[PDB]
Paper text:
Import of proteins into peroxisomes depends on [name], [name] and PEX14. By combining biochemical methods and structural biology, we show that the C-terminal [name] domain of [name] mediates intramolecular interactions with a proximal [name] motif. The [name] domain also binds [name] peptide motifs in the import receptor [name], demonstrating evolutionary conservation of such interactions from yeast to human. Strikingly, intramolecular interaction of the [name] [name] motif regulates binding of [name] [name]/Y motifs to the [name] [name] domain.
Numbering used by the authors: 265 to 341, 354 to 363
């Protein structure tokens, strides 16, 4: 998955809270962690959840309201989904 590694375009988000996956479908993260999100066009519709990667390889669901969306970032190859990410 090129969005997860940052090879493809992705959205960047910062974790607000700690989260432990309860299910195989979810991924764990710590408060302050930076995650890559799939673009709108690759996002599944699961109410309360977004598709993300913490480690660049595994992907899974995170609670949408546990992260702040920071903006879209170009691959190496609620309105913040549009703005570009400025580190």
């Amino acid at each position: 998955i090129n969005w997860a590694s940052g090879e493809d375009d992705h959205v960047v988000a910062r974790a607000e809270y700690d989260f432990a996956a309860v299910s195989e479908e979810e991924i764990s993260f710590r408060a302050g962690d930076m995650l890559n999100l799939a673009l709108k066009e690759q996002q599944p519709k699961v109410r309360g959840w977004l598709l993300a990667s913490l480690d660049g390889q595994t992907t899974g669901l995170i609670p949408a309201n546990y992260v702040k969306i920071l903006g879209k970032r170009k691959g190496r190859k609620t309105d913040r989904w549009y703005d570009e990410y400025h580190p």
